[PDB]
Write a protein that binds this ligand. Structure first.
Ligand code: NAG
Ligand code: NAG
Ligand code: NAG
Lengths: 301, 96, 97, 91, 91, 49, 50
């Protein structure tokens, strides 16, 4: 039961190993997977943010939604043209859907997705070795203008096509420490703007409660022996390694993986015709090739 | 090419955790005690140093295996079938 | 009988099958820093390793100069032997002396 | 290369272009040869009817014009061929 | 991996966060383990006491010069460990 | 006695002479795509070699 | 003090001033390592060596 309703889904904060300041950080754009299987060099990237959707979750091109860094954590939106992809130089963006980008990239040893300028300007870099790919038996930097038109496989630029699915689960607790206030020998739960918050404390025993205003905890003297987190968070989140799972980790939903690998035709170069010299029981081929070109011989006996 | 699925970690705050057998492909499991996990926001458990973390890992098929995949076969004795053109007198017949 | 880092490290009866079996050399490490990542090391993809050094296909390495085709698997136009042929020619084809 | 004009803010489903007539292809053979759009060059504003080979408006023509021209590619099998269609937007 | 907050235009020497308390480090052995600010992450607006492990505002905070987050790193010896602190600035 | 891909593949009495002779292995190919360009392959310049 | 990608020269320039000038010198700089494994970027899970 794969769904396309993104109002039931929310973005999340990942743990990027290489941020703008060259150290791992929590990021609204975290690179989960990179696939490079198309024959035209295009790559598909999974990002913790959702693209092509607005703040509310409806389909809105030129808007992408992400997770804020504030203590009253909520979902923000921004315009799409400040999303940049790079490997060694800039990458052309071919398409975008929620959690997924499709780009055309030069060869490089890493993949970087960045939000340029404005608020939340950041970047995420992952060690991903991608190289130039080939279709035929002749190398080429660029597709030739005159060729053979052989069958190859490329990523579909249409986002409606699907390559599979990803599972979507209910989110676990996040446990912001700013919800806790330390007083003169006691602690208080301090929910933001009246939103309801569940606390679990280990004062002298395990105590769990739900509050909506600032609430004293009787048995606890330090903030580090109790936690509190937002309640009523029924927004499906991708099964990512950077998030503590819920108590019920059943597959709540499924989301399409866009840009499926599709057959098509594409040209390959035709090399210079060799000159053949004949001598008794042998031939001599005079070979001319600017690029590396594969030659195969076999006897017919 | 397999795709390695790392699920969301399980964290139980000073209570013991263990994991059972699974039918998933290459299911590898390990539990670590005495952790103190952190996320964006602060600490993740109310309990000091007896916190435990259960980490899961398995593999499945990549989304692009519908095109780039290999099939393993065991083949038996092969039979030869030929297409013959037979011209007898001035009558021509094509057959297999 | 899967082997880590070699061809057939992951196997299934079909691409959509649910009874997938694999023996990749995956192992989980103790988390060093106090974030919530899962550190792990795995062997390389044996399918990719096989693709790197698959050699040449049978379309290029096959005796008697005959070409290998799929769907179904076959080798077409092989010239290797002699075929005894018996024809029962109809008597309408013959003419009198 | 097979370029032709479309008016600004043209209605959806209006006649736009004819791929099959300009390439000398009949309906039955292109139906047999799997006349499909190439997955690389696709535009949300244009779609072809799969049996008549006629491009028409899918989404209404707007001013952002992607970058500028409209580009599309189609491909056929037996023989394997690729064809490119260019579309001018008259503002 | 540490999350802290400061207010806009905050006075010098004011409390920011207790690093030694949040990490669970003992208070009597910061100098024995050589508590020190990492040279890679130096913030002119922040300074930490080596004896107590309490972060403090060094220079007066200004978003116009900053813009965002403030990044700091500490390192400890015996065993060799590294920790990261990130501070959000309100407006 | 010009040879393709070798020194002296193009020859003339002078740089401004109109009696230029050459034997560069030019092979004109049938146009594959439906455009007006002239597809061709040639041997490498023997002077550069 | 700068963080630079690998290259065979070092250039310091004024991008848009009245001077509008650059200086380039030959200087071979390459990627540097700390341990016995190569790495493009420092990993999250490591050994924390000096
Ligand atoms: C929060 O949860 C409590 C649980 O009792 C519920 O009564 C309340 O309506 C919820 N929502 C708020 C305070 O917005
Ligand atoms: C075979 O040849 C004979 C004599 O040349 C002729 O009468 C006859 O029509 C031919 N048969 C066919 C099937 O062409
Ligand atoms: C394996 O792949 C590497 C890089 O992908 C390549 O350099 C090498 O030649 C390949 N083959 C072998 C046998 O190592």
């Amino acid at each position: 039961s794969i769904t396309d309703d993104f109002t039931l889904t929310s973005p999340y904060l990942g743990f990027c190993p290489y941020c703008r300041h060259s150290t791992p950080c929590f990021s609204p754009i975290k690179i989960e997977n990179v696939w490079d299987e198309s024959d035209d060099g295009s790559i598909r990237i999974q990002v913790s943010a959702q693209f092509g959707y607005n703040q509310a979750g409806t389909a809105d091109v030129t808007k992408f939604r992400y997770m804020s860094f504030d203590h009253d954590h909520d979902i923000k939106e921004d315009s799409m043209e400040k999303i940049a992809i790079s490997t060694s130089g800039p990458c052309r963006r071919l398409g975008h859907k929620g959690y997924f980008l499709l780009a055309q990239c030069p060869p490089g040893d890493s993949v970087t997705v960045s939000i340029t300028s404005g608020t939340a300007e950041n970047s995420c870099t992952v060690e991903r070795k991608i190289r130039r790919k080939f279709v035929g038996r002749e190398e080429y930097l660029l597709p030739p203008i005159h060729g053979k038109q052989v069958k190859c496989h490329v990523y579909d630029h249409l986002k409606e096509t699907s390559a599979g699915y990803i599972t979507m689960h209910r989110p676990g607790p996040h446990a912001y420490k700013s919800y806790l206030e330390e007083a003169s020998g006691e602690v208080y739960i301090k929910p933001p703007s009246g939103k309801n918050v569940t606390y679990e404390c280990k004062c002298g025993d395990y105590s769990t409660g739900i509050v909506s205003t600032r609430t004293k905890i009787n048995g606890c003297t330090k903030a580090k022996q109790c936690i509190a987190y937002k309640s009523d968070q029924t927004k499906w989140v991708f099964n990512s390694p950077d998030l503590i799972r819920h108590t019920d980790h059943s597959v709540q939903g499924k989301l399409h993986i866009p840009f499926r690998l599709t057959p098509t035709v594409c040209p390959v170069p035709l090399a210079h015709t060799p000159t053949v010299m004949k001598w008794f029981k042998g031939i001599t081929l005079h070979l001319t090739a600017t690029r590396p070109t594969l030659l195969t011989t076999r006897k017919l006996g | 090419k397999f795709h390695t699925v790392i699920p969301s970690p399980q964290v139980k705050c000073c209570g013991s955790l263990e994991c059972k057998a699974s039918s998933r492909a290459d299911y590898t499991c390990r539990v670590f005690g005495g952790v103190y996990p952190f996320m964006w926001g602060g600490a993740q458990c109310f309990c000091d140093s007896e916190n435990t973390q259960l980490s899961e890992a398995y593999v499945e098929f990549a989304p692009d295996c519908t095109i780039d995949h290999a099939v393993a076969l065991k083949v038996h004795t092969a039979a030869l079938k030929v297409g013959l053109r037979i011209v007898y007198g001035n009558t021509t017949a094509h057959l297999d | 009988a899967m082997k880590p880092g070699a061809f057939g490290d992951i196997q299934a009866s079909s691409l959509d099958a649910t009874d997938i079996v694999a023996r990749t050399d995956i192992r989980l490490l103790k988390p060093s820093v106090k974030n919530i990542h899962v550190p792990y090391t795995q062997a390389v993809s044996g399918y990719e390793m096989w693709k790197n050094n698959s050699g040449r296909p049978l379309q290029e390495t096959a005796p008697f100069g005959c070409k290998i085709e799929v769907e179904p698997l076959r080798a077409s136009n092989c010239a290797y032997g002699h075929i005894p042929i018996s024809i029962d020619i109809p008597d309408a084809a013959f003419v009198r002396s | 290369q097979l370029h032709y004009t479309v008016q600004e803010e043209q209605e959806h489903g209006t006649f736009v272009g004819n791929i099959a007539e300009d390439l000398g292809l009949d309906i039955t053979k292109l139906s047999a040869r799997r006349f499909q759009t190439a997955p690389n060059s696709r535009s949300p504003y244009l779609e072809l009817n799969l049996e008549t080979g006629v491009l028409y408006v899918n989404e209404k023509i707007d001013r952002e014009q992607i970058c500028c021209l409209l580009h599309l590619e189609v491909f056929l099998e037996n023989p394997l061929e690729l064809f490119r269609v260019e579309i001018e937007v008259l503002d």
